[PDB]
Amino acid sequence: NTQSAFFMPSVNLFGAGSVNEVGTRLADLGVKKALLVTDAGLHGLGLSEKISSIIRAAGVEVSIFPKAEPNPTDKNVAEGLEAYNAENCDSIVTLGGGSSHDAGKAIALVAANGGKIHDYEGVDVSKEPMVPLIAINTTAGTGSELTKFTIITDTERKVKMAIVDKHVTPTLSINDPELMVGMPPSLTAATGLDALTHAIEAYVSTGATPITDALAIQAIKIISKYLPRAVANGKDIEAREQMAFAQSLAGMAFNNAGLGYVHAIAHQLGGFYNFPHGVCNAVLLPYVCRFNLISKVERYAEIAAFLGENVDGLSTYDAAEKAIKAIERMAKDLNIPKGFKELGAKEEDIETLAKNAMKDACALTNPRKPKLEEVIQIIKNAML
Template sequence: MSTSIALPRFLRIGAGAVEELGSVVAQLAITRPVLVTDAFLTGRGHTSRLVEILSKEGIDAAVFDKTVPDPTTDSLAAGLETIRSHDADAVIGFGGGSPMDTAKALAVLSASGGEMGSYKAPRVYTGPALPIIAVPTTAGSGSEATQFSVITDSATDEKMLCPGQSFLPIATIIDFELTMSMPPRLTADTGVDALTHAIEAYVSRRRNGFSDGLALAAMRTIASHLRRAYRDGDDRDAREAMMLASMQAGMAFSNSSVALVHGMSRPIGGHFHVAHGLSNAMLLPAVTRFSLEAAVGRYADCARAMRIVADTSSDDVAAAALADELEQLCHDVHVPTPRSYGIAEADWNSRLDLMAEQAIASGSPGNNPRVPTAEEIVEIYDAIYSGANT
């Protein structure tokens, strides 16, 4: 049986690669893109820098910098108006996962119309869309290399996974120097997010040989560099390694799938406005312990790739060591529990059944080595609230 693989057509990777954005866009015969970003990057002068780079190639770029963390259907309206008024022929997602997800959604909606909810899984959309160029400024989401966009329904707080090759960037610029100013909290959350992508891609029921290689490589790199980047944001080697690993992990899960962590993470983000990477980090150790028995060998491979255990260690020992290490990593980078993050217990408990229902409806838990019931998902949510092990 064959495996279908989808990747960006162009990749520019390395220090200073952002300076080549104009030539990449010109090569694609794009002349009127909209640069989709956020107010923070505009305030720091980064947006004007990219507009200038594009202008030098004769490219007339408009700017939409009103993206919001964990973008919502309501937040897309102004972006669509910018694209229409500029008569745009492409979108450039510049920033973390939220600006890139916003750019992807705008690319599809501006070309095909409709409501964002009509593009959510299980539908896989491959229809018309504006070309997407991605320029990430964080090392974690992997959105620069994936065929997914995640948008929250403003009416229901449902975090919708919207898949399909129409959401895949045609070109990606990977310049680790853009991540050098990431604060420790963001470094940790996006780094654990990337690790989650790699682990879930490797243990997923939809895994394949192509995604396996990328996932294992990303795990090894993240294990040896995330703590370094967290402790010292000026560590260029660690920043560069994390940026490459994030892209590899993104390519891995985009061509495999995510699983239970992501299925449970999206409702946390949708209901309590917890950043995606952080909600993944809250869940990763507990979900891994829940899942171990169904894929001991696979989780053992992860531990060996991360050099947690010797290659000669038994699968049982290695898999258990992986779960221990994930708990220690989250402790070392100060991942909060939902309680310590500030979510009231009554609010948390009142939404458990709905969150479990939404997690299952996303389809991601069905890719997990151990497919949970709704009751088991509620038990995991209960366990992570105050930090208990599962």
């Protein structure tokens, strides 16, 4: 069919100070006890208590679960579901980056569907809406506060599982850039390059629509102008607010268009080595774009212009090549590792990695359909 759908939370708050509304919103939802899912760093920095104060200052109780781990695991989700159940909670508030949103989302799905998070790996495999959730985002690259995606790790298959289900669209989303000033430069760069990967893969995806296209183009332009500014000075408020907008645009686009083999392979490198998601995407992006070039050359040529390149007097092909060169230049200027072996990757895993990548749902929307030898060759090119 030629049918499509657009998903996002019904209410999404933006701008400096929006977090000061969480409690009121939680009260309007008619909830009484919320599990605060955050990470140990943000809890140690004091964010958990500062936000809990706002929540309980509105008549809703909150119990903090600062046990969401970068690249969240099935163990984190099971332990959280116990907290949720033992702690008599009726809502979830996620505070942090994509790991906290996805952990809270998985907890919320299993708290309403019963099984294990692994049971819902795939597309809309769940059979009921998740418990009420307000997602407070503090990184500029996931968009998970708006998506129907939750990435939970199989520690046994060592695979970052993709649960893509409409029932994990958060109830309300909050994007406060004042909460993002504290991102160190490497984190700023990695999340920003994850948003850029989101927008590029959404723009070349087979599930693209004119709506997702509008959003992705804006995201690329804004990231290209403001991400280096956010990496160079995290106290540049303009760059922070524009990167928050760019992150939401890119999340909006990929949620409804689909991603591709950058994310398909990155999920395997992250399930095997706990590498940062955004760094995997940044290392892989130029190679997968070069692989995809012959399928979407006009759109990669447009991406080169969106990325600031001059394409006057150039063929569509040469213009498309300037886009890969600009991506490599951006990654070089933001100090992204050059390959995966310098980070700890091994050949004895490449074939397994490639075989697992061909099973990720994101691969379904990649514009060029590959043979195992191609995924393997891409992974080999990303080793050095």
